Amino acid sequence: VQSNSTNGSQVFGFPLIPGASSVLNRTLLGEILNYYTHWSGSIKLTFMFCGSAMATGKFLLAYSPPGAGAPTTRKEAMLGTHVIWDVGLQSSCVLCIPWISQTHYRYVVMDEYTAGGYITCWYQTNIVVPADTQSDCKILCFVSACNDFS
Amino acid sequence: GAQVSTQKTGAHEIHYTNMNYYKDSASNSANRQEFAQDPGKFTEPVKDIMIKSMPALN
Amino acid sequence: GAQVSTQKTGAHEIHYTNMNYYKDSASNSANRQEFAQDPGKFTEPVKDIMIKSMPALN
Amino acid sequence: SDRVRSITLGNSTITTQECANVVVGYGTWPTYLRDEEATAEDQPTQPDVATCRFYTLESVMWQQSSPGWWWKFPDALSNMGLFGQNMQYHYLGRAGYTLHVQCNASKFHQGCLLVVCVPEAEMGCATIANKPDQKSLSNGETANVFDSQNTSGQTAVQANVINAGMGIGVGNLTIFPHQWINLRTNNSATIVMPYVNSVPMDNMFRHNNFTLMIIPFAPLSYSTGATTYVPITVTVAPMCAEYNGLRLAG
Amino acid sequence: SDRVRSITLGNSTITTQECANVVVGYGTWPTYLRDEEATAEDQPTQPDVATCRFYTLESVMWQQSSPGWWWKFPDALSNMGLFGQNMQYHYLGRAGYTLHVQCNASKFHQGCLLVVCVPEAEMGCATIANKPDQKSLSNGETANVFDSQNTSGQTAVQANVINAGMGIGVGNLTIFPHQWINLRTNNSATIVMPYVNSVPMDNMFRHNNFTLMIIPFAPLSYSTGATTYVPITVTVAPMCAEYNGLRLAG
Amino acid sequence: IARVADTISSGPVNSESIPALTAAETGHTSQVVPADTMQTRHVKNYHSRSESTVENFLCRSACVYYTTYKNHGTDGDNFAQWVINTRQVAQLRRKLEMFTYARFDLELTFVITSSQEQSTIKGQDSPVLTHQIMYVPPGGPVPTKINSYSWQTSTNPSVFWTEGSAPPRISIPFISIGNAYSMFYDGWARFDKQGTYGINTLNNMGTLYMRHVNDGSPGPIVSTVRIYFKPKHVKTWVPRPPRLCQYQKAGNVNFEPSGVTEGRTEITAMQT
Amino acid sequence: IARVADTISSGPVNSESIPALTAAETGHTSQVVPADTMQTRHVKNYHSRSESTVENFLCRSACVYYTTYKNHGTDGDNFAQWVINTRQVAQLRRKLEMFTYARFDLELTFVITSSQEQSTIKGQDSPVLTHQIMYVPPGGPVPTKINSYSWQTSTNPSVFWTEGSAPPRISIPFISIGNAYSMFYDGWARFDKQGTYGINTLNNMGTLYMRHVNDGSPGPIVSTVRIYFKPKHVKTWVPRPPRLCQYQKAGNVNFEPSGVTEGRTEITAMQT
């Protein structure tokens, strides 16, 4: 992430496919799911800011259910399920992805019927730092299952 | 001297019997069951208890 | 722990036993029985009840 | 007497003086989902009167030679005001439907049509090694027309009436909830169709819960000098609509 | 501590770590209309979570020389998803609003803005014998900008900041519900605004219940090498929305 | 129990009741019974309706599919595979398609047979063959060769069987994603409706793989495996009209237009 | 039972509670559920977690190893032998290595098959073969020949089996020296650290020996035996990260450096 000259830029994104996507398939949740064919339940994503203490900023964490493609702008992303993450004293923020499906279970494998939807992140505000501070910084993302999961 | 227990069934719509034929417990079939879970030892291994609704720090 | 039920017999001229040997209900033999019928959902799906002896209209 | 009925939903009322008793699903009146039978966790949207009102589909003319007409519902109502907008903005949704089919004529006219609502009315293609086109299956409120003879084309629907578009006898469609409009008996028919599926809620663009078919078993016939323009019109209202999965609109 | 708050509405949550206590109307929390205070007879539509969720307006950059910005609400949200569609399809409607204004900066930056919500903020025209243009008054989510000096034009708004666009001292705007964002104190401010009018419900296109104004009383200032891009962003959610008079959409 | 309705004696009638007339247009059947049209005697009808129950109709083991494999071949290509698909078989498909939705457990039986291929080899006396049937769920490792590690089967269920024993048998519990299996699907896989259309969009039930577990012998052998399906504990919903057209494809409902009945000389003819 | 947590309805919230923020640095997961982030409906979730139990994960019979032997050979060298080693098989090893320690009973199944070798001999008709599988614990007498007295088996357990019968089966109780089997061993066999390093220092589980118990016949035969392992009553401790590198050796954990995931065009790309 960095200081931007423009508003609403995209930070990251990927489809919600825990058993296939390169983002999740080898994470612990993915590794367990790779031994199952079908799965169900809600998921948590934790984002930990690892920049300097003198750095502040805000982010949009959002989930967009299928029936439309991934958002192409913050304006569209914000219309889904979302959390505004205020980077301050607490370093971590959690985005909970609710269970939304026409089914009770989804396929572990990529499948068109049990489409995952999309997870994206957009800047809400700029990353603002004082003089003699590096504006370039990193964020770590962690993933785990919710209590409602099988 | 068989025991009687239940079969796994689907939720939100039955017994079977089980006799042991051997003198060694190693001969018994697998102990498949619902058991119990206690994930806290791996998900919350923390001395000072955190409250879900509260700030983690202070 | 077997259950005891009846055999189908001819009308207008007997028990058998049934023990389950598996831990999974999917292993049980078919649920063949007389059950019950309720054809009205397909033969009379009508809000306003018709009387057999009466004119259908008025 | 029992020939007269009135239905009020939302901001619309249909009053009929010559009608059949109302046919109701498989004996099930439409309701909202229970906590016992649920998937999606988010609190659902319930537009209530905003979408549960009646909408009228494009009328068609009944010719003495007409083979019949059909509509697919989730697609038919995709542009119908707020019902339309709520499905355009959601991943999942559910609704039952009230289908009221009308066709008046003079006492001197004769003919008879089957009004039937068929779930999962998957269509066969006229070309065997192919699949039907989207426009051959549904045109929103514009009815598709059945063929009197075997039809053709690479993406055409095998619309010959006798097989009801799906390879079954047309005469056996009476299994499905249905009612008839016999011009000497009534002017309209009413069918109440609850949501029916393998799942509690579904995507309203990928799947058509049911198709309405209007089939003239007895063709329209009249003497000369009698009115020649005899329309058939269809009016429908969703019930207990629920939506989940609010998202960027499709 | 009391510096941290979290607001959840519909399918959206805003969490803030450095904020002011929430300002609430004139002590009134937004509610739905009572039977005692009603006009329209039709059963109202209550979209609930479909429209009561948060929406984000176009962000602006705060320059050390900026005179300030404003938005009119019913107009600002006219294209905001289903809130937008429900007003496009109804004659009457009512809603309260939660306004959360954000602007973060480093501890080394200084400046301070007034965040104020003003009811019936009728605008004066720059040309005295004239009326302002529609686009000079509102650009949906795009903020209008106040002028540092006296402005001009036949349909221009007299946007000079010192008169707040209406001929009053800018320093007296504090009567209206307001909160400040002082960069050394907080990153965001929250105002809850109940519906306020002479009538229980109104037309959401002809009238703007209130205007949000963001005014830098103390301009942004910083040392060299410090971040130069410091945005201000506004996020709003309607509450207890009600609609009456379903009609052909405008 | 499930006894057919009996018959009540009925004498002469002269009244305003009209059981004979109705309005078919209303969408319900007439409830008229013989006691309403002619004079009757009492009949204690002891007949039952047990064979008409859904469970009895469906619980028979039908051949669904069969394929072959050999004990010799090129580069390890000696195994058969089959995508689970219950629509490749005309009789079973027809019965299953009578209900729009169904929920059931499935019992499988396999029948494995083999024969000799024409050969010039003397000394073909061979040991009894053993066969391996393995099920690979969607996304599992796939065999590419008969000696591939993919056959280790650490988790995937499989069955090993020796010829001469009773045919293999196994129970599969209901496995749908939804609460019932759909027989029909009036829809598309994708939101833009650009994928396939119809029932095959839901068919993601895995594949069976089959091979010999002996090594090769000079005498060539060809084996055939027939897979049988017997639904159990079957609950069904929403009956449909039986098909009149013959099936063309397993992946869809395309059809050849077909008449509704065999014809005859006239409407009053007795010779049909 | 083992039911998944259900969902509690949740209305609008405006308060000082902050379930959305935490401190990952503290080493515990967030306990946030959907009721804390969005408005929810009540959901009576009836799903269970039975297949996730350790017992179900592991109790499948995996092929671990196979080898061969012939009915002809030189100087009695017609038997197979195998050192017990569960690390020679990629799929089973991977599953077992997920837990650092485990305690379980082991059920074994053997699958024995055979085939003919190319020969010029006519008159190869032969009687059914019987096989002997013998287990020799560390330090026992060892077969050197198929006709050695070492096969008398007065104490060592063994199984005799005739082709055509159901495959052999036997139960082995937990046998460790310690209170659990170790999957990993960060240490050395010797105090001077001059022996081997790693898990193989603990592998002293004995050897299986296998042979035909018929006499030889002119027609040459080659036999293959597959050994299957099914852990039961399994209790495990201290889970570990699954391996990403492919296994190289059965005796150690040497590995080829491997990336953590398949790549993609960009961080915002949907096509992974």
Ligand SMILES: CCCCCCCCCCCCCCCC(=O)O
């Ligand atoms: C090798 C032994 C295990 C065999 C496992 C095979 C399981 C295949 C799935 C069978 C159920 C198919 C149900 C389809 C019904 C339908 O969609 O209409």
Ligand SMILES: CCCCCCCCCCCCCCCC(=O)O
């Ligand atoms: C011939 C019949 C008797 C067969 C006896 C074979 C016994 C071999 C030992 C099996 C247990 C091996 C457990 C290893 C587990 C581990 O160390 O991780």
